[PDB]
Design a protein around this ligand. Structure first.
Ligand code: MG
Ligand code: MG
Ligand code: MG
Ligand code: MG
Ligand code: MG
Ligand code: MG
Ligand code: MG
Ligand code: MG
Ligand code: MG
Ligand code: MG
Ligand code: MG
Ligand code: MG
Ligand code: MG
Ligand code: MG
Ligand code: MG
Ligand code: MG
Ligand code: MG
Ligand code: MG
Ligand code: MG
Lengths: 257, 139, 179, 125, 55
RNA sequence: CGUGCCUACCAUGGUGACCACGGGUGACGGGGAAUCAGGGUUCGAUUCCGGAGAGGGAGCCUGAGAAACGGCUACCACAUCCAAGGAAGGCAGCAGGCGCGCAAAUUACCCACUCCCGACCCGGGGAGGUAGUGACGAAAAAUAACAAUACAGGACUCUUUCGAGGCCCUGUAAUUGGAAUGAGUCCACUUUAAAUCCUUUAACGAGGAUCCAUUGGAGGGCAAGUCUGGUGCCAGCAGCCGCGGUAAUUCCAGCUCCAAUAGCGUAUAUUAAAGUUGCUGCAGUUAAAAAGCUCGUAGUUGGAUCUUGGGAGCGGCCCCUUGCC
């Protein structure tokens, strides 16, 4: 090919957008943004498909450019501005407010938390550096660059970030015994306590997690988002602690009805 | 006296790949001379032009004279005697007509009663001999 | 390019031997008993039975404590219970292999209709299920080879239809002649 | 005689509208036209008939239920602004009055041939 | 080599016979029904030695 | 940017019987498809990922991004208009045409869905979507039945019955109804951008001229004719075996049957059948096959032997060896 692509096929769309076969040939390709396309979620899919706010796609383009939808406190003019894990979606004229977390199966869900939690947002530290004249800098997976954060922030930590002023408040570090949530891989949407991490010099460390009722998984560092401080979640979480049940437990739940 | 060690997969594959050639079906499937020697170019049917009407002998336990058409091929350019099936149809074939032809039962062999004719006439001037036989349309 | 769907399942198997005297007699007496159309909708039942037998042997292959064996075994048993081939009893996998052919034909639409009356001779039941004269709950049925689910099994009652609903569909001819 | 029920009822004050899934029942007559459905829904919601829109219908194989999507609008400005113009076209508010091809494209190629004033001349008349 | 004169000799010399009227054979389901009823339900009085499906 | 990517100097190296190098491919590669014990074998032009090329082949400006071709420059091969002085061309984009063949659809409608681009809620999109052709293939499925009355070709429970028939199968070109209901003929809704198609509903719409199921076959394999008339090793049939030379169970016709059924015959590539390519799983005295014999490297295979009984505790842990520091 010649330069960057500019489309995306409906079949080539990722699985968790819950898109259909017979509908159309083209998937919405999300805009270039602060989240990768394998992990993102388009606004046209969010308003159109799941919430059933708008039947057609064009109605979403009408309402967003009539300024009803804001992301992280401010209005995004785009119809396909990409979202990400742990982002604030607020809606102004109708009293409604949304949070993006993961279902136990691996999908985005609806979580109608209040304006008190609209104020507060979590985020993961990507890396840390120093710039001009000896000042520090922290980089977020949400592509926030913030200077003078703290001296006591490790690379793989979690910062609670404010969307009013954009300045940090009340960080939390990475330690054995913290409650984390999985954002990637085959076990996404799993919430559990970090048990034991193994460090390899081969650039990819592993982490074992346990949760309530003792089931244990394992994953890699970039798939990990620290959510709590010693089995205490900072943010309310949908469907219990979001534990994956079993195939048999899902069947028995739907038989219990 | 086979070979059965764990590290002998190369010897087994090379010996089987050598000994696969002596089968006649495989060697005429994947040796080029079977494709580029016969007519039809490996296809089902071919068109041609009637060159002449030829009667040929039959074999010895059953003696008759079979009725065939010599054909210049449109596609390749090789001359072919082709058998004309039913009671009539020698009257239905005239000189210099577009004739569609096919094989009989296997392309490497003729039929039993016929010496060297390998080919069967299906249509003449885009009309089948079946339709020409049981009252259907015309030439 | 275009994207609508491309998927194609043949619920249909040509048997291998073409001309078997015993096979022809068995399928002919099967046709004559359960009143079918042609042997393609006989071979439908054979293909469904073969699919269920392959699933059953793949389940009997694995170990008893295996979660896939437990889940798919209970699921196949629930499907067969909802159809009405099995009892609510023998939930082993080997009884599924103990099943014969005729059970699916016995649990078709028109055969259960003929057992439940209002039918009068299977070949006339063919007409009664084609011409809109036999129903199921609130969605009126046209199709003969229907799988009567055991939990419904009873609601065969048909409104706005010539022997039960009312109307002059072709007796209008006779009574205009009697005018 | 005919019965209209609403199954699923969305409130959308982003658009100032209310959406519903409409089941029209039929033990009797054929599929009801656009007029009487609109009047029966406008009476059972007690609003004006010229502002409620409804579209899309199947039929469940012998009498049965026909399922539709119904927009209920408060204001006529919101009706004119939030609707597609083809659903305006049933009530006649929007028209283009000559929907032919080769017109737009032959104007494009004649404007691509020449330039400026005579371009405006040929492309406008 | 041999003479190409005789062609369609037998089919020409064959005397024609008028294709007399047949009743319409019942089709599909009704055909299979009389296939069943012709041999499975009233041939059990006959004995199992001889066979007579056409003669 | 890293590099024999290129220059200069210096060293003489690198690969290969574990298949190098070189030819062939009717070879674009995968995700996949067909084929059913298991193991495989044969395709993958093609809707998704990725690569390549816009007649061959070379060069280049702009631009973040091209060796772009619905951008440019020259040559070669075509080819248009020429007032002969010169101009423009690139459908392996969408329809459509010529040629080639065994082999393939309408110069349609629309941005309403899907998404994409631009300054931008509005523009535009043969990308797409809808209709028309469409027996590539698939699914579901009537084709005139259906219960009847009557005649019985007569079977069956059984009574001397030479029949009670509260069961029956079937032929009734026999009658009667349900005159069931459909295909077509058309109003009106809906469907849709605009229609169409399906569903719904009104009015028609069946008594054998009906509103008509064919395709093959009837010696064996192989289900089904030792029926009839012609034909006389002629014609012809037959995938093989074979038939035909005056009685043809096989040709040609008619009649009766047989098989599948809105799909059957044919030709061809190919898979199973084929344990007739065999690793599971073949042969090698005589049928095809053990080299004339022996040494011999690469390959392949390679004797035995080095950590054990127990203990605690019910009904997995430690040691008397059981992770060292
Ligand atoms: Mg491309
Ligand atoms: Mg042969
Ligand atoms: Mg040099
Ligand atoms: Mg090639
Ligand atoms: Mg298979
Ligand atoms: Mg296999
Ligand atoms: Mg591609
Ligand atoms: Mg290119
Ligand atoms: Mg291009
Ligand atoms: Mg072009
Ligand atoms: Mg024949
Ligand atoms: Mg005959
Ligand atoms: Mg036989
Ligand atoms: Mg043949
Ligand atoms: Mg052998
Ligand atoms: Mg010998
Ligand atoms: Mg020998
Ligand atoms: Mg050696
Ligand atoms: Mg050893």
């Amino acid at each position: 090919a010649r330069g960057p692509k500019k489309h995306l096929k409906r079949v080539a769309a990722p699985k968790h957008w819950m898109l259909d076969k017979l509908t159309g040939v083209f998937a919405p390709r999300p805009s270039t943004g602060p989240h990768k396309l394998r992990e993102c979620l388009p606004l046209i899919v969010f308003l159109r498909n799941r919430l059933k706010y708008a039947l057609t796609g064009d109605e979403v383009k009408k309402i967003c450019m009539q300024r009803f939808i804001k992301i992280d406190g401010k209005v995004r003019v785009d119809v396909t501005y990409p979202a990400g894990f742990m982002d604030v979606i607020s809606i102004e004229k109708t009293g409604e407010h949304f949070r993006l977390v993961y279902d136990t199966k691996g999908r985005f869900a609806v979580h109608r938390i209040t304006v008190e939690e609209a104020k507060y947002k979590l985020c993961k530290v990507r890396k840390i550096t120093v710039g001009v004249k000896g000042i520090p800098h922290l980089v977020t997976h949400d592509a926030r660059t913030i200077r003078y954060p703290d001296p006591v922030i490790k690379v793989n930590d979690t910062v609670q970030i404010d969307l009013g002023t954009g300045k940090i408040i009340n960080f939390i570090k990475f330690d054995t015994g913290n409650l984390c949530m999985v954002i990637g891989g085959a076990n996404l949407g799993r919430v559990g306590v970090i048990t034991n991490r193994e460090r390899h010099p081969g650039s990819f460390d592993v982490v074992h997690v346990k949760d309530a009722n003792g089931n244990s998984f394992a994953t890699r560092l970039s798939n990990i988002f620290v959510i709590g401080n010693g089995n205490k979640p900072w943010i309310s979480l949908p469907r219990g602690k979001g534990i994956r049940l079993t195939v048999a437990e899902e069947r028995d739940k739907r038989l219990a009805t | 006296g086979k070979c059965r060690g764990l590290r002998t997969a190369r010897k087994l594959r090379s010996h089987r790949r050598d000994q696969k050639w002596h089968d006649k079906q495989y060697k005429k499937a994947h040796l080029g001379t079977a494709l580029k020697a016969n007519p039809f170019g490996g296809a089902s049917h071919a068109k041609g032009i009637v060159l002449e009407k030829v009667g040929v002998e039959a074999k010895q336990p059953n003696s008759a004279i079979r009725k065939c058409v010599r054909v210049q091929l449109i596609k390749n350019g090789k001359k072919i005697t082709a058998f004309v099936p039913n009671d009539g149809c020698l009257n239905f074939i005239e000189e210099n007509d577009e004739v569609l032809v096919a094989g009989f039962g296997r392309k490497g062999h003729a039929v039993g009663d016929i010496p060297g004719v390998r080919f069967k006439v299906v249509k003449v001037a885009n009309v089948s001999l079946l339709a020409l036989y049981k009252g259907k349309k015309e030439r | 390019p275009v994207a609508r769907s491309w998927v194609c399942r043949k619920t249909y198997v040509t048997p291998r031997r073409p001309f078997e005297k015993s096979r022809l007699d068995q399928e002919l007496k099967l046709i004559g008993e359960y009143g079918l159309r042609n042997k393609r909708e006989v071979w439908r039942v054979k293909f469904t039975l073969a699919k269920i037998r392959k699933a059953a042997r793949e389940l009997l292959t694995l170990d008893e404590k295996d979660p896939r064996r437990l889940f798919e075994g209970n699921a196949l048993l629930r499907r067969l219970v909802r159809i009405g081939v099995l009892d609510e009893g023998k939930m082993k996998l080997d009884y599924i292999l103990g099943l014969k052919i005729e059970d699916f034909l016995e649990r078709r639409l028109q055969t259960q209709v003929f057992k439940l009356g209002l039918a009068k001779s299977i070949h006339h039941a063919r007409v009664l299920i084609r011409q809109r004269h036999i129903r199921v709950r609130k969605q009126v049925v046209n199709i003969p080879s229907f799988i009567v689910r055991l939990d419904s099994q009873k609601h065969i009652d048909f409104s706005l239809r010539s022997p039960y609903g009312g109307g002059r569909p072709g007796r209008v001819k006779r009574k205009n002649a009697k005018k | 005689t005919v019965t209209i029920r609403t199954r699923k009822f969305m409130t959308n004050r982003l658009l100032q509208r209310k959406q519903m899934v409409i089941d029209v029942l039929h033990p009797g007559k054929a599929t009801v036209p656009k007029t009487e459905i609109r009047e029966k829904l406008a009476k059972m919601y007690k609003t004006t008939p010229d502002v409620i829109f409804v579209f899309g219908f199947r039929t469940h194989f012998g009498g049965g239920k026909t399922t539709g999507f119904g927009m209920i609008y408060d204001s006529l400005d919101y009706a004119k602004k939030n609707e597609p113009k083809h659903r305006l076209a049933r009530h006649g508010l929007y028209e283009k009055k000559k929907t032919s091809r080769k017109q737009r494209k032959e104007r494009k190629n004649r404007m691509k041939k020449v330039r400026g004033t005579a371009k405006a001349n040929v492309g406008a008349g | 080599h041999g003479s190409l004169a005789r062609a369609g000799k037998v089919r020409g010399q064959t005397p024609k016979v008028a294709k007399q009227e047949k009743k319409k054979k019942k089709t599909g389901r009704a055909k299979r029904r009389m296939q069943y009823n012709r041999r499975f339900v009233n041939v059990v009085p006959t004995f199992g030695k001889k066979k007579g499906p056409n003669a």
